[PDB]
Design a protein around this ligand. Structure first.
Ligand code: NAG
Ligand code: NAG
Ligand code: NAG
Ligand code: NAG
Lengths: 532, 532
């Protein structure tokens, strides 16, 4: 039967799912690791023991334990990102969408969800891989990984809570795909990993980590890069936060053994309730438990690895959205509200700047303020609001990604860069937020092709174009159709640094994406902070 | 006789001079101090002893000893600024242009020439006061003062070479005008002092110095302010330079007495030949002997005086030219030439930046470079050239003046600000230099009214308009004609910060002159240099 597949770990039975007046096969909730529960909490993952009989892969699995956003109860704009299945530490499963009839050896794409390393689910409606798998005829896989303390609590030196286990969860899933996707009709030698935000940073981390490089062919990074300021911490800071978490739960702190034992006896929600109390600074776009530069998963500092070319050399396709920072300002900066235009006063602008660059001294804060202030009209509420939006997006997403693309392109085999700037016609978030962090995902997954979702005809066309770019890149290492008559997405080169916009208007090629601001964030500010 | 005037110092006989098909009286070369020669070199000036008989004031006096520019021999653009009379240490004289018939008690304007405190003459063709005196019916006076080491060598603590004597020369001339102008038909209670560059800085210094305030009514500052970075030095730096001058002339340096005695035995040209060897840094727009913050002429630091309102409160009219920095880049920055378009390479841009801000550390240099570089087109020769031009003009003239105007306006009785941006149709300097430092002077003195000079009809109109603004301001404290139908020059206020452009086009009012760059130069950079 087309729904029965025998893998190296055992047999699995999928389910036939409808999609755009047709059907395809789906294998949901396939286990790739042993449940990281009890004594296994915080530990590196262990491969799933093979099973006898048939694994029922007809329904989505549980989501990993995580902080749940209740800032806007009932609001679809925020709830669409929350777990839609019951949460459990028993959450290491993957999902596969297979074209029908089953292919023999076709292109494989593996999705890695984002969520700042503190949240995320492979089961969100927005991550339904049936549209992409059906439309582009690729085998689509979505994996899962532990987030928050469960996946990133780090007490370097200890083997019980070494840190980065969430990244190892991802690697184990990639290993499973490498070893078994052939039975689902996928080509293990043509696997593209792609992800957004923390998922994009994760993709870059697998490009960097020697232990992950051999498991995939190409990569796509959406609004995220491994060198982002929020994406990793030092071993010392990771330890400090782990200890502070224990301090928040009245744990014995005399030794790592004592601390970990205490943390392992706590219910999942107990850790989550105090998770945010361990941050250094009053800040936005900063998360408690993230990857740690350990000298193992990451041999040396990310910068030294990027500079020496110590990473997988292949083709990459990546990009950012126009207003990456709006989400974070709305949730934590004074003056911003969901139901108002959020015009910002000069004073709230100052407060926002300090929250946005928590590690900077006063001189550093002055430099940022000067760089983003129009002194001919400094009390303009719209300008201050948009200025802060740019500060957050440039510092946390765009400039780190531009630093990554330029360093990578020197050693890589082909780079394609995009700037997504289309605001969906059916967005429920206010207009001031613009082209929001994460809202290009629905286009990548083809939701606009579903009539009931209320997208325009132009948006369906944009989605089809984007899905074809992504899948063609996954298949050939080039988003462009060999010998087509459509406008070509030029290769990003060290010299020309070209990129294209992604919207419903005719393709336009540009150069040096936000170069002025990124020279500030990537070269000047770091120098200022290190000298003063 | 109309040409004979009896002053408190003795009788003087002037000469009738033709002017625009008419005539007026001129009294040239009137002594206001005893020749500062021999034992008097470097000493404060002494009032001229009254004389018997009639002083022959029919010809221009000698010019003070100074460095003479020979960079472009025979070239009118540069030679028009050089001394046009024989040089001598016996140079403290003033010139007066009086309307005919002699007025009874009319508005008086006293011109103070510029020249970076190292040069200047009251006798330049461009400073001929007959046009202004005749056209606006004012008594026009031009004074002189010692420049270079002769007027500013400073060995604080010593009464033989205390420093600032050139400024005291200016004060003595103002005192003479206060005491005697009434005999020439001028009103000593309605005297306006005006000057350009070092002369403008000098005007601001008299506004600040308690000992000079009572000698004039209003002031006009053209392309210069007392707080300019090149306009003064500390007592320590002044001493260091005085000692280095002695070291350059093989002087005994065991004591001030030894040093001064040695310097007094040297011929004037001997001092001038080594004058430029005492600067701290490799730099442009920096001069060796300038005013010193002594605690006498200047009670405290200029900044503390400006902040506390420790200065004469009256009305002021001031402004700058569009391209103040071009002259200095042409003479000392690599890549600039008089006969080429001077497109600057990225490398020469860097060299230029270091020469322009000699006191800045590397981080400071990086900040300037970032602020003036278009990173989307960094190798554009025109942009690099114009960027450097702006750096020099903003740092040395515009921003210091804007800091002055804003601090002054808080306590003053009326401020009028202008931005001169008309390039003369008959300029002999290359086009890349734009609206050059000092080229608004010919309009203020009415040269465009002289047909033989080859100016256009529009330029004659601009000159007449400017002369009337200046003279009306001198007479009433307001450049505008009471109840006229012409466009009004608005008052510059702390809140609106309005100013007008001065060109042949219809008047346009603007606000916050180069505010973006001046926040950088006046607030950010100083903070960066002091913290790092
Ligand atoms: C497990 O598979 C069976 C079919 O064998 C079916 O009941 C369903 O798809 C799964 N069970 C649940 C939880 O509904
Ligand atoms: C990628 O690598 C292949 C084989 O080494 C080479 O022929 C090709 O030019 C490379 N492409 C780029 C854009 O570097
Ligand atoms: C001095 O005045 C006399 C007239 O009394 C006349 O010769 C001339 O104006 C002056 N002398 C010189 C130096 O020409
Ligand atoms: C100048 O001073 C006079 C008298 O003190 C005052 O009436 C006038 O308002 C002042 N003007 C300005 C612009 O400050």
């Amino acid at each position: 039967s087309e729904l029965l597949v025998n893998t190296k770990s055992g047999k699995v039975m999928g389910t036939r799912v409808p999609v755009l007046s047709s059907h395809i096969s789906a294998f949901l909730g396939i286990p790739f690791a042993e449940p990281p529960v009890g004594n296994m909490r915080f530990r590196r993952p262990e491969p799933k023991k093979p099973w006898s009989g048939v694994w029922n892969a007809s329904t989505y699995p549980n989501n990993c334990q995580q902080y749940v956003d209740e800032q806007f109860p009932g609001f679809s704009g925020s709830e669409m990102w929350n777990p839609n299945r019951e949460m459990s530490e028993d959450c290491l499963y993957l999902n596969i969408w297979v074209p029908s009839p089953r292919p023999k050896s076709t292109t494989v794409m593996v999705w890695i969800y984002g969520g700042g390393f503190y949240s995320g689910s492979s089961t969100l409606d927005v991550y339904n891989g049936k549209y992409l798998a059906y439309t582009e005829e690729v085998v689509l896989v979505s994996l899962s990984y532990r987030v928050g303390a469960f996946g990133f609590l780090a007490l370097h030196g200890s083997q019980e809570a070494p840190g980065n286990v969430g990244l190892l969860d991802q690697r184990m899933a990639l290993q499973w795909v490498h070893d078994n996707i052939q039975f689902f009709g996928g080509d293990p030698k043509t696997v593209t990993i792609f992800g957004e935000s923390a998922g994009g940073a994760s993709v870059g981390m697998h490009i960097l980590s020697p232990g992950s490089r051999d498991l995939f062919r190409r990569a796509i990074l959406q609004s995220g890069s491994p060198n982002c300021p929020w994406a990793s911490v030092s071993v010392a800071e990771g330890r400090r936060r782990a200890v502070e978490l224990g301090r928040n739960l009245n744990c014995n702190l005399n030794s790592d053994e004592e601390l970990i034992h205490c943390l392992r006896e706590k219910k999942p929600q107990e850790l989550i309730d105090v998770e945010w109390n361990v941050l250094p600074f009053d800040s936005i776009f900063r998360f408690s438990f993230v990857p740690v530069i350990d000298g193992e998963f990451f041999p040396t500092s990310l910068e030294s690895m990027l500079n020496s070319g110590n990473f997988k050399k292949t083709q990459i396709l990546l990009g950012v959205n126009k207003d990456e920072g709006s989400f974070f300002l709305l949730y934590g900066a004074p003056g911003f509200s969901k139901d108002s235009e959020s015009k910002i006063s000069r004073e709230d602008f100052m407060s926002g700047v300090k929250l946005s660059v928590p590690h900077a001294n006063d001189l550093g804060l002055d430099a940022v303020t000067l760089q983003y202030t129009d002194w001919m009209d400094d009390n303009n509420g719209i300008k201050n609001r948009d200025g802060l939006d740019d500060i957050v997006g440039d510092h946390n997403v765009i400039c780190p990604l531009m630093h990554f693309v330029n360093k990578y392109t020197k050693f890589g085999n082909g780079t394609y860069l995009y700037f997504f700037n289309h605001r969906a016609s059916n967005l429920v978030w206010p207009e001031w937020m613009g082209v929001i962090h994460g809202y290009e995902i629905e286009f990548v997954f083809g939701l606009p092709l579903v009539k009931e979702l209320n997208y325009t005809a132009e948006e369906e066309a944009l989605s089809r174009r984007i899905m074809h770019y992504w899948a063609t890149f996954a298949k050939t290492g080039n988003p462009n159709e060999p010998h087509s008559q459509e406008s070509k997405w030029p290769l990003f080169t060290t010299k020309e640094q070209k990129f294209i916009d992604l919207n419903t208007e005719p393709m336009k090629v540009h150069q040096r994406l936000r170069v002025q601001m990124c020279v500030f964030w990537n070269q000047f500010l770091p120098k200022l902070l290190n000298a003063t």
